[PDB]
Amino acid sequence: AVLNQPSSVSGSLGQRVSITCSGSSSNVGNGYVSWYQLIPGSAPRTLIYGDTSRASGVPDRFSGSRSGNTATLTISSLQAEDEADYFCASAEDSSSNAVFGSGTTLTVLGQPKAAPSVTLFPPSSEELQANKATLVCLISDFYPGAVTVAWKADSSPVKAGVETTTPSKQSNNKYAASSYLSLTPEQWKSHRSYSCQVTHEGSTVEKTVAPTEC
Amino acid sequence: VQLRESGPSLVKPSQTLSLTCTASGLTLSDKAVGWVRQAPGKALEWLGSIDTSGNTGYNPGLKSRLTITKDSSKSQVSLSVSSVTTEDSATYYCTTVHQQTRNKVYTYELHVDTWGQGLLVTVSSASTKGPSVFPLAPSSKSTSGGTAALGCLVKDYFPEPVTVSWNSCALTSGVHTFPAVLQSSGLYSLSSVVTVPSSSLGTQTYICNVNHKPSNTKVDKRVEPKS
């Protein structure tokens, strides 16, 4: 089976949010639910066990509670570090077949807005001497994480050969994204300039690189 | 308590995935070792566990393809997944589970205590390919009047993952490593960037260390500024 969890919940910095963990009378009914935190790029971290007990190192702002066939994980005084995926888990009676929840992505709102800074790297000497050419557009230090990226060649739109990652959190809890434009050295040498156009909250930052001189 | 997963990161479809887990610093509460995996975009999935007495419990939806044995002498646990499909590509975790008695009747309570680092496994017929590493050199464009951005480009590798550090991990402040893009050719690429003070560009050498375990490849690319 799978325990029912809300797909995603949101809370403001310094507030409290609760994540519900619904189940049947066999898994959560017996009632010893556990809670785990998955930060991308890190091993899962046990938060709560035995419904209420906090695991080793878990601050007191993480609490647990159960009511019949529904357990609840409450996080008070939300910090930006609390943005992660949360899963509940319970033993299905026989204590040999664990069941995890569908998962809940917690996003922390109320962070200061930040405009993106964009760096556009031309292909290097090494890559150009390998019959390859890739333009790398790195976007960092922006919030919220909703941007669009567009490439130009001599102010004419380019749609082919573009690969872009989804925004991801960085060290200072701001977002960063990357986009790439794969070319042949002939194409790179052909045009007079190339541009990476990043749009964030109605405004647009554009970086231009040229093959002529760097 | 330390748990280390070992095994292949690439397996061909229809083959058998074999994973080992070596534990160090076992305590008295570590009474069973279990296996959990997480496919991309899906929730955590329990696989099975085995206790000190040798009893094995399996996920009933997968027991026809799972086997879990242990070697307490070497302090190891092994997981085998037979006839793998692309639905079996996931990060496989080794775990120590605890069992504390609430007794008051025998009401028990189980939870995962320590999680392993996780081993990323990809099911595919494509061949392993080590990465080409090129430098993203800082120029008079990539400077921000005091800070300058530099990085390295890890191009065309398979399969995931690729880890990148800077100066053999001596440089961590201001580093960001982006997730990978899956090109049309079926190869992965990512970038690692770090912002440094502009003054140090002529006094501090910056070397990006790319590591690609799936092909046992390690690259140390030096990133020199553009003249």
Residue numbers in the entry:
A (entry chain L): 2 to 9, 11 to 27, 27A, 27B, 28 to 95, 95A, 95B, 96 to 106, ...
B (entry chain H): 2 to 82, 82A, 82B, 82C, 83 to 103, 148 to 269
Sentences from the paper on this structure:
The cow antibody repertoire contains a unique subset (~10%) of antibodies possessing ultralong CDRH3s, which can reach lengths between 50 to 70 amino acids. The unique CDRH3 structure can be separated into two microdomains where the antigen-binding disulfide-bound “knob” sits on top of a long b-ribbon “stalk” and can bind to both surface and receded epitopes. BnAbs from cow-485 were named Bess, while bnAbs from cow-488 were named ElsE and assigned numbers based on their order of discovery.
Bess4 is the bnAb with the broadest neuralization activity among the lineage and was able to neutralize seven of the 12 viruses from the global panel (58% breadth), and the broadest ElsE antibody neutralized 67% of the panel. To assess epitope specificities of the recombinant mAbs, Bess4 and ElseE2 were selected as Bess and ElsE representatives for competition biolayer interferometry (BLI) against a panel of human antibodies that target known bnAb epitopes on the Env trimer of virus 25710. To better understand and define the epitope recognized, we chose Bess4 and ElsE2 as representatives to look at the effect of V2-apex epitope mutations on BG505 virus neutralization. Bess4 and ElsE2 neutralization titers were knocked out or reduced 30- to almost 400-fold for Bess4 and ElsE2, respectively, when mutations at position N156, N160, and K169 were introduced.
